[PDB]
Amino acid sequence: VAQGPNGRALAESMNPDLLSAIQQHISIERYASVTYLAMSIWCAERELAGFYQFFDGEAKDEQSHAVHFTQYLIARSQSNDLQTLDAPRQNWDSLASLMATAFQMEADTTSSIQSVYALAERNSDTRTTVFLDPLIEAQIQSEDQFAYLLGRVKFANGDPTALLVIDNELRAGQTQRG
Amino acid sequence: VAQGPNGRALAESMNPDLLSAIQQHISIERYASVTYLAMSIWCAERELAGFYQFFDGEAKDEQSHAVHFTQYLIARSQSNDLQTLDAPRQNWDSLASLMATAFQMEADTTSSIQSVYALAERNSDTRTTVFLDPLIEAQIQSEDQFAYLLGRVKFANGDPTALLVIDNELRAGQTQRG
Amino acid sequence: VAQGPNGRALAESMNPDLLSAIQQHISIERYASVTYLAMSIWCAERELAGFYQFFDGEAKDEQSHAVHFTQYLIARSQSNDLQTLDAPRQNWDSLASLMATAFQMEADTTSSIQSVYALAERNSDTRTTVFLDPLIEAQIQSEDQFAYLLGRVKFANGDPTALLVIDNELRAGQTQRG
Amino acid sequence: VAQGPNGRALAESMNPDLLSAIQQHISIERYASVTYLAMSIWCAERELAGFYQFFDGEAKDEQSHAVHFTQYLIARSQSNDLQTLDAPRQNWDSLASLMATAFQMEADTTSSIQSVYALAERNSDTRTTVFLDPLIEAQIQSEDQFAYLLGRVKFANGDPTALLVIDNELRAGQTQRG
Ligand SMILES: [Cl-]
Ligand SMILES: [Cl-]
Ligand SMILES: [Cl-]
Ligand SMILES: [Cl-]
Ligand SMILES: [Fe+3]
Ligand SMILES: [Fe+3]
Ligand SMILES: [Fe+3]
Ligand SMILES: [Fe+3]
Ligand SMILES: [Fe+3]
Ligand SMILES: [Fe+3]
Ligand SMILES: [Fe+3]
Ligand SMILES: [Fe+3]
Ligand SMILES: [Fe+3]
Ligand SMILES: [Fe+3]
């Protein structure tokens, strides 16, 4: 039985470029986490308590995704390489602008997964494409959800009254089309 | 015992013009269904999740009405004739305009039932008038409900804040005067 | 952030040919729905109440699949285009012939999904292949089920006694190999 | 306050021809009752226990309809006139022939109600048409049910095995399309 790079028994070797792509993607998930933390703080500073609670939870969820990926590398007997994490953006001129960054962050997270997916397909790594499939499925829902929150905030057209209503929706857990 | 046109034992023959009118009315119910589906999509595209849920349910209900009519023809030993279904309208400039189409669609559905009713009366078909009576009763309630939703949307006068409030009413199931 | 064709924030553009293929597939699902409605009526006209109940439920399920696809287009920020729906077939010489059409309809539905799948793969649209994967999985079960019902009806060899027994199986909810 | 023919306070006089038609219709209901009793006995004599139980219940139900009509005459302050009741038919060459008589009896019962209905309309007796409306509604269901039982018996094509299966359906309470 062969030994994998992390020292565990190796079911099948992984291409080093694919390994690097997964390690980099873990950093994307972690960066999404700290970005949602920054967004939760921005919302709390403006008394948007529902948005604060929503993004506080999204930050924890993105961290969970990152750990899920680290567990996949363990399962494949590959080394993890936890990287330096950049500071998040922390300033926005409006909630609409913040929600635009959040949507783009979600879409960028999917693009990163898609790039790993294509690399796995090029290397005939079916374990990895199967691993990523439910994560892309979840990204579709997250993109649908963030398009909903962004579009609803934009519909408010900067009216504080409408933003307070939406803020209360989020505090109540009404965060998608349903 | 006589055989009806659909092959079952025939309790009493039905005038062919009345039969044609019922078959055409089934198409009206089906067209209302796909129209409410189109309206549910229009609302979902604009993050009006409560309106989306309302019209998604109305579409299923209109389909149920259509099937209810097909069952009446079976019970009368008459043939069904499921027809080509036109594409629904799919574009509106505002929610107020969409709600106007919905109300008119509901009133037009009642007019179709009324036209079948008059034909049954001309032919002394008491089974059919008795069959239609509760459906007209339901139409009164649906017309009252759609007048309520349309009037409430018009009261909002295009203010996104008021439309978000009404949208949340609909998601909560607050869809008529009560 | 870019705007998609249906006006929502766009996570990633979709190839227009793939979009057309999905819109056409929605029509296939809707056509399967009205076909199963027609089959339910044919069975009701011949007092095959179990087959009537089975196909009445299949019609509602196929409609649900169609709506599921419309929701995917919403989630991808693509326009829906609900199309004219052809009249279903409504005449069969025997239950065995009707069940043959039903099986072929199910297999044709899968072929349509497979054609969309191949187009998504040609365009590297992983969101779409992930979206379709569970639907193909469900098609395998539906094909297995319709092969079971068709084969059991054919085994009956046109004997009304055996067809009454199978009819009662279906009314009881015994609709697959289990 | 005026006194009605049965001695109670009279809300509105009833045309004597309409009164005669209602009294005659009560005899039709009673005759349907004893006919279903005769049919229940014919089935019991041939060990068709499910058909026996079904018709035993139908006989009691038809009697209940008759009493319901006598109560309407009381409520209208009209005299009842319980009439001589003819002997029922008691001989049939087959279950299919018996079921044909039963269906025709049900349709003939509706025709009698329709004839009373038309007379009430000619006399602008809205109390009577309102009274009859739910009864016609019930007749539609009974006609649908007897068309189902007759058609299913005819499908059996005289095969004792299929008739035993249907007999067991009826004993279990499976007596309509559902
Ligand atoms: Cl804003
Ligand atoms: Cl509006
Ligand atoms: Cl067959
Ligand atoms: Cl027989
Ligand atoms: Fe993530
Ligand atoms: Fe995310
Ligand atoms: Fe309707
Ligand atoms: Fe309606
Ligand atoms: Fe389907
Ligand atoms: Fe299907
Ligand atoms: Fe999968
Ligand atoms: Fe009766
Ligand atoms: Fe009766
Ligand atoms: Fe009524």
End-to-end CA distance of chain A: 49
Residue C21: both structure tokens together: 């293929």
- Going by the annotation, the residues of the binding site of D for Fe(3+) are 29, 62, 65, 106, 133
Q: Going by C-beta distance under 8 Å and a sequence separation of 6 or more, which residues neighbour residue C40?
A: C51, C52, C53, C54, C55, C56, C58, C59
**Number of residues that this document lists for chain C:** 178
Residue A13: both structure tokens together: 């070797």
End-to-end CA distance of chain C: 49
Closest CA to C75 of A76, A13, D109, A141: A141
In chain C, the residue whose alpha carbon lies closest to the alpha carbon of D151 is: C47
Torsions phi, psi for C3 (to 5 deg)? -100, 135
Instruction: Give the whole-angstrom CA distance, residue C158 versus residue B167.
Output: 55
Instruction: Give the whole-angstrom CA distance, residue B17 versus residue D91.
Output: 40
Residue B171 in contact with partner chain A when CB distance is under 8 A:
yes
Closest CA to B75 of B170, B133, B165, B4: B4
- Cβ pair A29, A85 in contact under 8 A: no
Q: Going by C-beta distance under 8 Å and a sequence separation of 6 or more, which residues neighbour residue C144?
A: C176, C177
In chain C, how many H helices and how many E strands?
Answer: 5, 0
Which ligand is nearest to the Cα of residue D129, counting in written order?
14
- Cβ pair B164, A156 in contact under 8 A: yes
Q: Which residues of A touch B46 (CB under 8 A)?
A: 151, 155
User: What DSSP string runs through A49-109?
Assistant: HHHHHHHHHHHHHHHHHHHHHHHHHHHTTPPP-----PPPP---SSHHHHHHHHHHHHHHH
Region label for D77, one of left (φ > 0), alpha (ψ between -120 and 50) or beta (otherwise): left
Instruction: Give the whole-angstrom CA distance, residue A23 versus residue A21.
Output: 5
Helices B16-45 + C49-75 axis angle, to 10: 30
Domain count across chain A = 1
- Cβ pair A97, A25 in contact under 8 A: no
Q: Which residues of D touch C163 (CB under 8 A)?
A: 155
Torsions phi, psi for B85 (to 5 deg)? -110, 120
Closest CA to B51 of B149, B144, B141, B147: B149
HSE value, Cβ hemisphere, 13 Å, CA-based, for B55: 28
Instruction: Give the whole-angstrom CA distance, residue A172 versus residue A54.
Output: 10
- Going by the annotation, the residues of the binding site of A for Fe(3+) are 29, 62, 65, 106, 133
Provide the 3-class DSSP secondary structure of residue A9: strand
Backbone breaks in chain D (C–N > 2.5 Å) follow which residues?
none
CA B154 to chain centroid, in Å, comes to: 22
- Cβ pair B162, B156 in contact under 8 A: yes
Q: Which residues of D touch B130 (CB under 8 A)?
A: 133, 136-137, 140
Distance D137 CA to ligand 14 centre (A): 9
Q: Going by C-beta distance under 8 Å and a sequence separation of 6 or more, which residues neighbour residue B100?
A: B150
Instruction: Give the whole-angstrom CA distance, residue C76 versus residue C88.
Output: 31
Distance B39 CA to ligand 9 centre (A): 22
Domain that holds residue A53: 1-178
Distances (CA, A) of A82 to A24, A65, A79: 9, 14, 10
Distances (CA, A) of B60 to B67, B113, D47, D178: 11, 19, 46, 20
Q: Which of B26, B27, B82, B91 to mutate to test the interface with C (most CBs of C within 10 A)?
A: B82
What is the torsion angle, in degrees rounded to the nearest 10, for the CA atoms of residue A94, residue A95, residue A96 and residue A101?
100
Torsions phi, psi for A72 (to 5 deg)? -65, -45
Instruction: Give the whole-angstrom CA distance, residue D67 versus residue B120.
Output: 30
Instruction: Give the whole-angstrom CA distance, residue A38 versus residue A52.
Output: 10
Closest CA to A146 of C77, B61, D5, D49: C77
Instruction: Give the whole-angstrom CA distance, residue D130 versus residue C67.
Output: 42
Note whether D136 contacts B124, CB cutoff 8 Å.
no
Instruction: Give the whole-angstrom CA distance, residue D143 versus residue D146.
Output: 5
Distances (CA, A) of A171 to A55, A111, A155, A175: 11, 29, 19, 9
Provide the 3-class DSSP secondary structure of residue D8: coil
User: What DSSP string runs through A88-103?
Assistant: PP---SSHHHHHHHHH
What is the torsion angle, in degrees rounded to the nearest 10, for the CA atoms of residue D132, residue D134, residue D137 and residue D138?
-100
* Residue B58, amino acid: E
Q: Give me the residue label for tokens 């649209």.
A: C125
- Residues within 8 A of C (CB atoms), B 127-166 only: none
Q: Going by C-beta distance under 8 Å and a sequence separation of 6 or more, which residues neighbour residue A21?
A: A115, A116, A119
Note whether B80 contacts C74, CB cutoff 8 Å.
no
Count of CB atoms situated within 10 Å of the CB of B93? 7
Residues pairing with D3 in the sheet: D9
Provide the 3-class DSSP secondary structure of residue D162: helix
CA A96 to chain centroid, in Å, comes to: 19
* Residue D143, amino acid: E
- Cβ pair D101, D92 in contact under 8 A: yes
Q: Which helix (H) or strand (E) holds D74?
A: helix D49-75
In chain A, how many H helices and how many E strands?
Answer: 5, 0
Contacts 24+ apart (CB under 8 A), A59-62: A59/A33, A59/A34, A59/A35, A60/A33, A62/A29, A62/A30, A62/A32, A62/A33, A62/A36
Instruction: Give the whole-angstrom CA distance, residue C158 versus residue A29.
Output: 62
Q: Which residues of D touch C42 (CB under 8 A)?
A: none
Count of CB atoms situated within 10 Å of the CB of D6? 13
Q: Which residues of C touch A104 (CB under 8 A)?
A: 1
Provide the 3-class DSSP secondary structure of residue D178: coil
Residue D134: both structure tokens together: 């739910």
Closest CA to A35 of A83, A93, A86: A86
Experimental technique: X-ray
Return the sign of the alpha-carbon dihedral for residues D31, D32, D35, D36: negative
Torsions phi, psi for D12 (to 5 deg)? -160, 135
Provide the 3-class DSSP secondary structure of residue D3: strand
* Residue D166, amino acid: I
Instruction: Give the whole-angstrom CA distance, residue C150 versus residue C165.
Output: 14
* Residue A178, amino acid: G
Distances (CA, A) of B136 to B132, B143, D110: 6, 10, 23
Distance C71 CA to ligand 6 centre (A): 20
Instruction: Give the whole-angstrom CA distance, residue A96 versus residue A152.
Output: 9
User: What DSSP string runs through C91-155?
Assistant: --SSHHHHHHHHHHHHHHHHHHHHHHHHHHHHTT-HHHHHHHHHHHHHHHHHHHHHHHHHHHHHH
CA C53 to chain centroid, in Å, comes to: 17
Is residue B172 exposed (0-12), middle (13-18) or buried (19+ Cβ within 10 Å)?
exposed
Region label for A79, one of left (φ > 0), alpha (ψ between -120 and 50) or beta (otherwise): beta
Residue B123: both structure tokens together: 């032919």
What is the torsion angle, in degrees rounded to the nearest 10, for the CA atoms of residue A102, residue A103, residue A105 and residue A109?
140
User: What DSSP string runs through chain B?
Assistant: -PBPTTSSB-SS---HHHHHHHHHHHHHHHHHHHHHHHHHHHHHHTT-HHHHHHHHHHHHHHHHHHHHHHHHHHHTTPPP----BPPPP---SSHHHHHHHHHHHHHHHHHHHHHHHHHHHHTT-HHHHHHHHHHHHHHHHHHHHHHHHHHHHHHTTT-HHHHHHHHHHHHTT--S--
